[PDB]
Write a protein that binds this DNA or RNA. Structure first.
Lengths: 134, 260, 118, 186, 125, 147, 103
RNA sequence: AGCUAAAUAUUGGCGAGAGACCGAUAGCGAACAAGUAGAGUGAUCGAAAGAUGAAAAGAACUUUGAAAAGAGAGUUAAAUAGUACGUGAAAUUGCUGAAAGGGAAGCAUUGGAAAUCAGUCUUACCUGGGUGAGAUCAGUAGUGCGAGACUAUGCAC
RNA sequence: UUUCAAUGGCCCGUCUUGAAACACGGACCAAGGAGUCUAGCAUCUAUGCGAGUGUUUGGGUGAUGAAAACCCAUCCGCGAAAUGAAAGUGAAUGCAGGUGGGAACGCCCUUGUGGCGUGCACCAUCGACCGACCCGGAAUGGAAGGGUUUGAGU
RNA sequence: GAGAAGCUCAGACGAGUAGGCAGGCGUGGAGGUUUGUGACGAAGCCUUGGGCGUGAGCCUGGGUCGAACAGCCUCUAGUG
RNA sequence: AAACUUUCAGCAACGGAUCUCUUGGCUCUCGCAUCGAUGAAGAACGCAGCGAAAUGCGAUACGUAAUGUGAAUUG
């Protein structure tokens, strides 16, 4: 059993919880779902559609957490569908290598490696301490 | 509808030309503010509105029974897709399985505490928390017309036998309980949006086959009813396009982008 | 976002709105049978036309090359984490002082420019 | 100033189906790719007919399909029949031949009779998989002018068309203007 | 959720009934909860207020103020309490009204009718 | 609905689509369909010929129940029997022939159109056309009249 | 005037028809009231059957003579053949129709 | 010659439950002492008019004035809520400030003068150079059968 | 943003061939203010089913709480047969016919605006069948033979 | 990858009353959704400040204010 | 150079728009059937400690008897 990912995208392309669309700037759209890394509303980036999807989130108090969709046999098991790897407090290079290895070198999603690394870098730069100027 | 006599309960006639006044009818007599004022016009204060609303306006809309069953079947099928539930906003990230079926002992529940405990154990209580947090006062004048509060929709419990499950689950905010034999589209696709979180009982899930039947078999509880046939056998167009049967016969891929 | 050129900076005021106070400044197309603005006689006011449209690349862009994305809470600022170089954050006018401070601190952490900051 | 007459400027063809069916859009997407990446006019014809309206896609019957593929000089013995539309049943045909039919949708009775007779029913995506270019395929259409509106279209003097009548019988447009005994006959 | 046919959830009707209730109904409307000791003794949660009832204010600016109910202004839905006043410009002490639900009774004015009401509610003696 | 109506787009246009010369006055050619012989004759004679006049006899107090006689053709006679009856008799060789009661199916007369299988069949009907009876006899069946 | 396609108009609305417009907003209420009324009658006349036994008759005319429907009451000859008096048939719930005859 | 329940109607009266209706020029004419005030001999005609404040706590007292009131005060979270009272637009008006003006003014294009606003530029990844300190890195070893990825234990100091 | 200078700029709406008009309305401002609803019809489009189609006239789950949603039977409406005023009659010679153009497909020639074979839809046309009319027409019946015709037919 | 409702390249063209069509802006109410805004100040109003859109309009800074209000997908109308 | 006129802005006026509410209206549904010569509907005149309009009442007059609640009415 498998409901088509193309069918799911057609249903949720314009109406779903994680889409933030606004008529400003000619109708911009943003995707906020946890298992999407690009941040834009597209079928190739929608993790609710793609069987194999990746996502990067901030981790408390530091580091990032990589969310990946497991084997499609867990499609009807949402509790077993998502695997979360909390990257420890490692250097930026170590984090990039770990993400690149777990995403691209394993054949999972070779096209999302650059996006995942960039998002991880942005999260780390956001988590860095603030040198307040008084 | 407005009153039939609204705007007509005055005695007024037009004064004609030569009085340096608009030819709209005016109230006769004297000794009061209403005297000499215009009436009977949609542009006049305390007059008659343009095209007064009638009660015999068509309020109800008829739908073919086959179309209604098609919509209900699509809503039930959509409820079994985990991505659609997340799309509709149901917090079902940590629930064990979609569709979610519980034991028939739930139908014999007697307390809201038991119902809440079951929801927390099957990880469905996050929807209840979402509904409780989302409860807010309505924006606009609907709060003056017995519609003060608005909130989100929670899980839809479907049962076969009522032994206390309805009373146990009814007080939980956002939770709607319905019998399997009378599934409602307004609850299965609230707001016209598919992907409602539904919790079935064992008996209700087992009776779903007899309620809807199949494409080739007739439904036991719906006479001469068959499930609709789809116009596409496999809706994975990307797989069909990238399959060997097509890629082996297509011409040169061509340039996806051409330099200026 | 680079070399932004405005074809016109005038707001296309409505005809005779200066003459009469009941006539609003919002543009309305003159449809009179003897209207001179509609016929575009020399010396009259200009009418909005599709030819005045700005370049698609530079359209909707602030003079700094960014686009003012409205933010009402912290989550709206997190929406701009990846689009740091194209979208700036405009805090909604109905946001309280506490939430405004939180939004500013989150945008500063994310490196997102804020238009109505301070 | 340039003196150019603008007569055939805007094309009067659909570039997208009016229907909002998601599965129909999926079929359109598949055959958009097929028409672009193949040099077969069959794929272009299917894509064009996918955009057409309900009136422009008349239904066809299994009797009509059987009659068209069982002509003496036909040689359409085992070829697959493709129609972009609904295939209806004809109860007047007591015995159904073995037919391979591909269509948008099938009537329940027609599909059951085809399967019982030993034939096969395919969707358009299945037809695309089996015959990516439409080889050995009999492409058919329903009768476009078989609807009620074409009985009245073109009504006028000496046109022999059906008038729009509230009822049927005498006292209903069967008088002066319709026979010689009453002034004139049309 | 209300299910009875004789119960109205209309805001208009509910407000009309509350603001138009007669004195007998307003007596029941102006009810105050009993103290923890009173609840554990009489097995009653709340009771309609009465004159010479010992109460302490729970909410409002006059928190912690104990005293007896000087008068029960049922027309204004207010309780006038002893020594709970505010000074005026001329020096007169204008009493300050407190809602019956904003105070808790610490000692009841127990008469024969009050005792009957307690037993009717299900209270012990 | 109202939001997709032409009135919402006609807002701001003075004449509301009815023109500045002819306007949208009250009935300028009369009410209803009056004038079909004098000033609407050009429309009546070209689009509704035969409207004016008398043709035929009058029948006082016509009742359609005695005139009730729906018709069915030969190529649908075998569709009136159940599927099991068709599998038992159609195309087979049995000592008895199936009986098709057209009146019970809801028809008054049997008309001759289309073809019939060579298997014999008994047709019960109030009326039957000559061609229908001939084709049924050719197929081997018989027609017995009922009331 | 008439200048568009289609059949000529035939609207019968030249009277004050808006005064006598009948709405069906009370249809579910009427259905509930009738259901409650027959439930009340069933409880009142229990254990007697809610509906009396009716004879089987052939509807008149050639359009409906091939069907069988329910009649009003049994004829006197039918009651005599069944050994039931007409004065006792009503008591035991058997309707009597003096107009109908057995041809 | 005659009687007869039910299914049927119900813009009147009484009671009740509701609304994808109107939110004070709307909705009944009437949300308020409304068929009231008021007009006509009469038949009849027939309005306008809701909101301080949580609580009057509705401004004690002093001073000026014949008084009305003003100024100090006082109450209040608020008197930018004082009963002429929720907020408080426009038309219109007074004071102050700026500018212009030889029988109209208003507008459009361009620039001048005056006034006002925008930049945080050079941030950020990365690296050259100095020192401090650090549980320490490449290749590895053990802990899913080939290739590859990641985590963990140790070596590599 | 204000103002100055240069240049240009007639008061809007309306009827009208023609308005700046010595043609009409407009002293100012706020609020209100005019293609709506219903019974039909016609074209087009979408949806479901399809020689069928329409559950809501009605009945039941129904008491709980049910103006909703869900289920259910017999009539009936429209369509499946037309023609004639009517009595009446009532649609296959054939592969449900032939001819021309004709989508798609298949086979060749070699690059052609190429030939061969069927041929969906649609149009034009020659026929065949049903009803009406005009015939001959070998008490009642009009079976075969026809026709310069006629029908909103097959 | 670029909302395949997408991306990319190239050419030609652009007056308009009556009138036709399409795509959009704005208003009241309804369903769905946004751990949506808000007494640490919602709506409204004023503004000699700022920004976006050809435009209908929208966002924002400052002042007043005191209780509700909004974005997106649909439904609807006593909607400019 | 003032005064005067015009525009804008800040305060102060005139006015009551906008916004938010609403014991009101309108509409629908459900249930019921009860005026009068034993004097109806309606009209007039009076009744309270301070009461003119409204509600209530009738010289037993914002009312008596009886019944129920149980400490108020309130300026």
């Amino acid at each position: 059993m498998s409901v088509s990912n193309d069918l799911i995208w057609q249903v949720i392309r314009d109406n779903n919880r994680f889409l933030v669309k606004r008529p400003e700037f000619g109708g911009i759209q943003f995707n906020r779902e946890p298992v999407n890394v690009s941040g834009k509303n597209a079928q190739r980036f929608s993790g609710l559609c793609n069987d194999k999807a990746v996502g990067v989130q901030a981790n408390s108090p530091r580091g990032v957490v990589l969310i990946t969709k497991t084997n499609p046999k867990n499609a009807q098991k949402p509790a077993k569908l998502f695997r979360k790897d909390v990257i420890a407090n490692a250097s930026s290079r170590k984090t990039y290598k770990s993400i690149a290895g777990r995403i691209g070198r394993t054949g999972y999603r070779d096209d999302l490696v650059k996006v995942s690394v960039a998002r991880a870098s942005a999260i780390l730069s956001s988590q860095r301490p603030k040198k307040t100027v008084a | 509808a407005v009153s039939e006599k609204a705007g007509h309960q005055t005695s007024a006639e037009s004064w004609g030309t030569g009085r340096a006044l608009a030819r709209i009818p005016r109230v006769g007599g004297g000794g009061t503010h209403r005297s000499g004022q215009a009436a009977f016009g949609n542009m006049c204060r305390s007059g008659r509105m343009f095209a007064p609303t009638k009660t015999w306006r068509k309020w109800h809309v008829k739908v073919n029974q086959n179309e209604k069953r098609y919509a209900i079947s699509s809503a039930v099928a959509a409820s079994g897709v985990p991505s659609l539930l997340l799309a509709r906003g149901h917090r079902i990230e940590e629930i064990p399985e979609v569709p979610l079926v519980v034991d028939d002992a739930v139908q014999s529940f007697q307390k809201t505490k038991e119902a809440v405990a079951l929801l927390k154990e099957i990880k469905a209580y996050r929807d209840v928390v979402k509904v409780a947090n989302s409860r807010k006062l309505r924006a606009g004048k609907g709060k003056l017309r017995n519609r003060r509060h608005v909130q989100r929709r929670g899980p839809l419990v479907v049962f076969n036998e009522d032994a206390g499950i309805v009373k146990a689950f009814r007080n939980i905010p956002g939770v709607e309980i319905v019998n399997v034999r009378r599934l409602n589209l307004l609850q299965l696709a609230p707001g016209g949006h598919l992907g409602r979180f539904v919790i079935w009982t064992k008996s209700a899930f087992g009776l779903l086959d007899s309620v809807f039947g199949s494409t080739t078999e007739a439904a036991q509880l719906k006479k001469n009813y068959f499930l609709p046939e789809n116009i596409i056998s496999n809706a994975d167009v990307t797989r069909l396009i990238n399959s060997d049967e097509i890629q082996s016969i297509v011409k040169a891929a061509g340039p996806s982008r051409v330099k200026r | 976002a680079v070399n932004i050129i405005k074809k016109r900076t005038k707001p296309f005021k409505r005809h005779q709105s200066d003459r009469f106070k009941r006539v609003g400044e919002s543009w309305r197309k003159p449809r009179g049978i003897d209207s001179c603005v509609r016929r575009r006689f020399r010396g009259t006011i200009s009418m909005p036309k599709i030819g005045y449209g700005n370049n698609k690349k530079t359209r909707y862009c602030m003079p700094n090359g960014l686009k003012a994305f409205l933010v009402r809470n912290v989550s709206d600022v997190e929406l701009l984490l990846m689009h740091n170089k194209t979208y700036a954050a405009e805090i909604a006018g109905n946001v309280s002082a506490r939430k405004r401070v939180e939004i500013v601190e989150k945008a500063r952490a994310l490196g997102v420019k804020v238009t109505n900051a301070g | 100033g340039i003196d150019i007459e603008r007569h055939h400027v805007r094309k009067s063809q659909r570039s997208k189906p009016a229907s909002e069916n998601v599965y129909l859009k999926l079929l359109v997407k598949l055959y958009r790719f097929l028409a672009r990446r193949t040099d077969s006019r069959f794929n272009k014809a299917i894509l064009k007919r996918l955009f057409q309206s309900k009136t422009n896609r008349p239904p066809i019957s299994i009797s009509k399909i059987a009659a068209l593929t069982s002509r003496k000089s036909a040689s359409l013995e085992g070829k697959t029949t493709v129609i972009v539309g609904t295939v209806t049943d004809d109860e007047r045909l007591l015995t159904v031949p073995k037919l391979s039919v591909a269509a948008l949708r099938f009537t329940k009775s027609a599909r059951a009779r085809i399967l019982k007779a030993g034939g096969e029913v395919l969707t358009l995506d299945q037809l695309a998989l089996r015959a990516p270019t439409g080889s050995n395929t009999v492409l058919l259409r329903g009768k476009k002018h078989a609807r009620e509106a074409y009985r009245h279209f073109g009504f006028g003097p000496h046109k022999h068309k059906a008038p729009y009548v509230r009822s049927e019988g005498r006292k209903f447009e069967r008088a002066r203007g319709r026979r010689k005994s009453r002034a004139f006959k049309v | 959720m209300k299910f009875s046919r004789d119960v109205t959830s209309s805001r208009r009707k509910q407000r009309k009934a509350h603001f138009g209730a007669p004195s007998s109904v307003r007596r029941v409307l102006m009810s105050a909860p009993l103290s923890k000791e009173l609840r554990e003794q009489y097995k009653i949660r709340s009771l309609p207020v009465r004159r010479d009832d010992q109460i302490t204010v729970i909410r409002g600016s006059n928190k912690g103020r104990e005293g007896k109910i000087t008068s029960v202004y049922r027309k204004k839905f207010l309780l006038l309490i002893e020594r709970v006043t505010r000074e005026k410009a001329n020096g007169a002490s204008a009493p300050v009204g407190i809602d019956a639900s904003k105070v808790v009774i610490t000692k009841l004015h127990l008469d024969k009718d009050r005792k009957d009401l307690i037993v009717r509610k299900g209270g012990k003696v | 609905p109202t939001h997709t109506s032409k009135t919402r787009k006609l807002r701001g246009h003075v004449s509301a689509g009815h023109g500045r010369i002819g306007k949208h006055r009250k009935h300028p050619g009369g009410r209803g369909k009056a004038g079909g012989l004098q000033h609407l004759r050009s429309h009546f004679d070209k689009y509704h010929p035969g409207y004016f006049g008398k043709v035929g006899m009058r029948r006082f107090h016509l009742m359609k129940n005695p005139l009730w006689r729906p018709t069915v053709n030969l190529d649908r006679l075998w569709t009136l029997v159940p599927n099991e009856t068709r599998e038992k008799y159609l195309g087979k060789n049995t000592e008895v022939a199936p009986v098709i009661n057209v009146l019970q199916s809801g028809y008054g007369k049997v008309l001759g159109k289309g073809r019939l299988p060579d298997t014999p069949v008994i047709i019960q009907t109030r009326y039957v056309s000559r061609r229908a009876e001939e084709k049924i006899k050719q197929a081997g069946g018989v027609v017995e009249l009922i009331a | 005037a008439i200048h568009v396609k289609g059949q000529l108009p035939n609207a019968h609305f030249h009277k004050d028809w808006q005064r006598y417009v009948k709405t069906w907003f009370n249809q579910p209420g009427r259905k509930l009231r009738r259901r409650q009324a027959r439930q009340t009658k069933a409880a009142k006349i229990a254990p007697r059957p809610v509906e009396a036994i009716r004879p089987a008759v052939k509807p008149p005319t050639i359009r409906y003579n091939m069907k069988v429907r329910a009649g009003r009451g049994f004829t006197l000859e039918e009651l005599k053949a069944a050994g039931v008096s007409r004065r006792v048939a009503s008591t035991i719930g058997i309707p009597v129709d003096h107009r109908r005859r057995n041809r």
